[PDB]
Amino acid sequence: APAVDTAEQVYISSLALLKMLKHGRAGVPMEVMGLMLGEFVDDYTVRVIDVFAMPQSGTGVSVEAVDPVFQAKMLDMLKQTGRPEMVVGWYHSHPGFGCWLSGVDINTQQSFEALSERAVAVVVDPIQSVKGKVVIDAFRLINANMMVLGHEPRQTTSNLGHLNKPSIQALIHGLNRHYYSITINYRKNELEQKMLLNLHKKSWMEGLTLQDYSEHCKHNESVVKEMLELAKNYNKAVEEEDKMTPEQDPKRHLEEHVDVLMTSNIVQCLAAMLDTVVFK
């Protein structure tokens, strides 16, 4: 009998991840959900090209939260636009609950898998996704007959499926017993990365604008005074170094202040004189 490989990956597009995060936060503290569109490229790949949100319902996140009219019309009109991708899976947000699948989540995932054996149930914690780390996982299922017979849920053929370790929070909520985590990889081409780079790409101008000269002088004064106190502390500590065999550093702080002073003043000087000589 065929067994899903542990090397199978979920390639989430940049747009899909951003839409998922935005929708998950927008519904906090409620649990929002939607359908992920894409394609099952092969037995070891599930590509999530796009994901569209779904209207909030008082039910919560269940197989009764997928309004057939909404889903059908959204798919038809996206196909009109040019996005004729099948419903690969579904996503919902566990705000602060970690990434796992509850009994009802497992239930809706069974419903989705009845549509197609390959189908992922990625979940995203929108409040644990503080800048930096993103708390998101993707699980499919384990067939009960597969587990009770003693055979492992997924055949292994490489180290890809075990580069990341499962979390305790997911494990107690049924991980590796009823659902298995699927490794998630982000498909970011050059164009999307360059477009996202504009978020903090400063300008062609701030490379040439001098600091407020009074503010610059005040900052210099404050940092030099702090550096004076640090130098006093450094002298005091070094005097102790003599009467002390090998047995916060006033030096490390001193070095940090020195580095900030030199970078600030070197930049300010160079920018000022470049300005003097490029602008007449």
């Binding site: 197989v63 057939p68 809706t108 419903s111 009845a114 549509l115």
Partner: protein
């Protein structure tokens, strides 16, 4: 009078948590006289103890599961997902409902009947088996009606919540349902729902 008493304080810690709400796959019925309710594919009657009738009269009413179809035959059962399909079963009539009562996802298979004969073969609990029965599935008025002959009429109607799935052509799916494992009191039952499509 000159009381002027102080006050102590005894706090009471308070907290709870809603668990993962548990789906109970329970069927209900009042076919002849008893409001029987069964949980379940292992079958266990919750209320309505040892049945005045045979189990078979209700074994045919048992989402989340669908028959196996070949690639030639359009699988209306399959593509109707994720929502699933709601059916009306006429034997006595049977309907499947999905409700949100309490903290249990209720997949009711609510049963109901009438015209129980005073000596009909359904209540003396006699039973040999259910011979394989072919359901001719075809579209009458936009509803997928399956006509099946009961051997031991059935006028099944299947409607998808996604009212956009194309209707398959009139085919002949062979169902083979038999009560695999049970007890004499019929309170710990295991059911078989094997069924494959045939063009």
């Amino acid at each position: 009078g000159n009381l002027l008493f102080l006050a102590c304080y005894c706090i009471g810690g308070m907290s709870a948590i809603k668990p993962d709400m548990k789906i109970k796959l329970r069927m209900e019925g009042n076919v002849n006289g008893h409001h029987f309710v069964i949980d379940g594919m292992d079958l266990e009657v919750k209320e309505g103890g040892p049945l005045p009738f045979a189990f078979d009269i209700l074994t045919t009413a048992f989402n989340r599961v669908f028959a196996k179809y070949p690639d030639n035959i359009q699988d209306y059962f399959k593509q109707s997902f994720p929502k699933g399909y709601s059916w009306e079963r006429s034997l006595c009539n049977a309907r499947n409902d999905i409700t949100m009562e309490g903290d249990t996802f209720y997949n009711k298979v609510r049963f109901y009947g009438t015209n129980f004969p005073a000596n009909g073969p359904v209540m003396q609990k006699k039973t040999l088996k259910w011979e394989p029965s072919t359901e001719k599935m075809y579209v009458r008025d936009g509803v997928l009606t399956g006509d099946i002959e009961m051997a031991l009429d059935f006028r099944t109607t299947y409607k998808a919540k996604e009212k956009g799935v194309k209707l398959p052509g009139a085919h002949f799916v062979d169902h083979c349902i038999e009560i695999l494992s049970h007890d004499k009191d019929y309170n710990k039952v295991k059911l078989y729902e094997h069924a494959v499509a045939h063009s």
